[PDB]
Symmetry: C2
Subunit: 375 residues, 2 copies
């Protein structure tokens, strides 16, 4: 006898949105006060030529650069204080659920409720996101325990593509029969690793958690068939953050700007757009899908201008907003979670049989495609 | 025609051992000078009963606690300096290969050379270990690029069980046909996250990298059949390290002792031994193996006292030294890599058909079993 590979579905999704938002106007007001304060405080070093003066930001600059209008944050006060310019997040006892696991648990509970099946049915938890709150014990195991789940759990990180890589992984796990269902969580406190003092990036990151339940198709009721997945990585330093455990072996570097998100945005725009467009069209052809026939695309949620170009190349025409979803206006860039927020929030109106594409892309470089069909 | 799950093999492994060791004698000399200096500096507090004096360590204490006699380290001087008591690792340019990736690449090249097949065949790289040097770009993508590989790559972390969880993940990837071969790397700079001032743990961690290539059995020449894997996690705070990206949002905590490895070692010993023993025996029964018939066991490599009890329980008699492999005497505890070092270094005098067990266990809690058979 041979065990056959089981096709998979996305059976449910969940979303946790933090209650507090920072509008571009609020972000820019604090940033510009910071700029003025900094330039005055450092005027002698600036005039000596030791450092460049800082430049003010504007809401028009942000909206033109990215389409972002606001972002949600877990901890607002420090982000809008020119003397702080970062989250203030006091540590919790080991006895308490961590802030990052708590977000994952809330999104997962929504997915579990929608799914409606006994949670004992979940055999793996994947915590797939751009930054774990600690190395060990794994976030996914903390989440597994808080949800009362059996089985196994682990953390995986490919930054902006963690949710599409996580869906692929989940599909292979249920495909091989070792589990009947997999819970993926994508908790993102991106405000925790953004440099709010950097004009080139201070508007980019926001916070959220998403979740998805993947199960084999022969047991699923409704949901979305996973028609196929494709994953690609190609090393680049154009999106990088050097913070991590070996900084303790060089504490003199710990407060350098490279210990937060650094993006060379012009290069990312030039290189990632054709990488992704080509990958989508190649993958569609491999699996016999006409990319021109897609009903909806849920692309990565970082830069509307990149999505416009990728979407146009995939569809062969200027995509409508309905068919090329944008949630980065409200959420800004949430790294791994963005394409999943778009999918979760913008799918109810489609017809049985409609084809969609979940596609993530960003740091690594990484990119992932998941073609789906409404059941 | 149906799509069958393709069985997997471990086709090759690789190992990188740092050139420098810290013997127990060297470790204890530095630790005891740190202790003597502390007691002198704090003499009035000690004499007032405000604190207890620190107690010296000894090679006898270390060997009794663990079986460890030495460890390899990537950066020795600070570990033997009683005023530093940590690695000193200057930062590299983004243009250079990172220290953690470099170790993985060296182990991977050994695996690739032993494998003898074109590296173009590798479709995925998994960097599976207890601590990533960066959140992004992923370590695995840096390793992929350095090795000149195509495909995709991502980082995954379940601490001490990352290598068995990675083997399971690789086998499911191969099994589903999306790739023909997977490279796993387990680079561990555990000296980077140990508290060398803590008497109960200063001797525990060392440094290494391992690698393995997993491929479909249909195309494999020799190697080891993966007969079955089983993964389990069960949340515990008895091994924990709170360092991570949100520490910058609470700087008061950033250098506290909880930002390095903290273990409640007696609780771990008492809880993890029966968890693992029962798991191994139950898994063996599930897949029709009599564990009393195993030719060799390659268990986790942290504490010889735990290995003795688990090995005796599994085999149903006292294992010989050759039957229950010990490499922790030389390497100390390398977290994820330990069981793979044992497997890589000690698979001599085994015949086609012989059964073996690779089993990891530790922080999470996590445990993984991989039953193998010599081809």
């Amino acid at each position: 006898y041979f065990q056959g590979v089981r096709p998979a579905v996305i059976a449910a999704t969940g979303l946790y949105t933090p209650p507090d938002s920072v509008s571009n106007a609020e972000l820019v007001e604090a940033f510009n006060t910071y700029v003025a304060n900094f330039n005055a405080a450092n005027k002698a070093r600036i005039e000596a030529g030791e450092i460049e003066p800082l430049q003010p930001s504007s809401s028009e600059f942000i909206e033109k650069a990215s389409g972002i209008k606001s972002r949600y944050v877990v901890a607002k006060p420090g982000i809008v204080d020119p003397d702080v310019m970062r989250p203030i997040i006091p540590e919790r006892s080991n006895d308490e659920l961590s802030i990052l696991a708590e977000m994952a648990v809330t999104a997962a509970e929504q997915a579990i409720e929608r799914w409606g099946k006994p949670r004992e049915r979940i055999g793996a938890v994947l915590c797939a996101c751009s930054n774990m709150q600690r190395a060990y014990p794994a976030m996914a195991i903390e989440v597994q325990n808080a949800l009362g789940l059996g089985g196994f759990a682990f953390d995986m990180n490919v930054a902006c593509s963690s949710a599409t890589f996580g869906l692929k992984t989940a599909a292979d796990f249920v495909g091989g029969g070792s589990v009947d269902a997999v819970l993926m969580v994508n908790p993102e406190i991106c405000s925790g690793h953004l440099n709010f003092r950097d004009r080139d990036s201070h508007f980019i990151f926001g916070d959220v958690a998403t979740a998805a339940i993947v199960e084999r198709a022969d047991d699923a009721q409704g949901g979305w068939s996973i028609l196929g997945t494709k994953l690609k990585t190609q090393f680049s330093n154009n999106i990088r953050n050097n913070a991590g455990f070996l900084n303790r072996a060089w504490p003199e570097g710990r407060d350098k700007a490279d210990k937060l998100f650094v993006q060379q945005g012009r290069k990312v725009f030039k290189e990632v757009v054709p990488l992704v467009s080509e990958m989508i069209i190649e993958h569609a052809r491999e699996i016999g899908i006409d990319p021109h026939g897609l009903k909806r695309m849920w692309l990565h949620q970082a830069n509307i201008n990149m999505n416009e170009i990728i979407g146009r190349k995939v569809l062969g025409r200027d995509p409508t907003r309905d068919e090329n979803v944008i949630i980065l206006d409200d959420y800004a860039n949430t790294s791994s979670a963005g394409s999943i927020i778009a999918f979760h929030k913008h799918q109810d109106d489609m017809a049985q049989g409609d084809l969609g594409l979940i596609c993530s892309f960003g740091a690594g470089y990484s990119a992932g495609t998941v073609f789906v069909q409404k059941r």
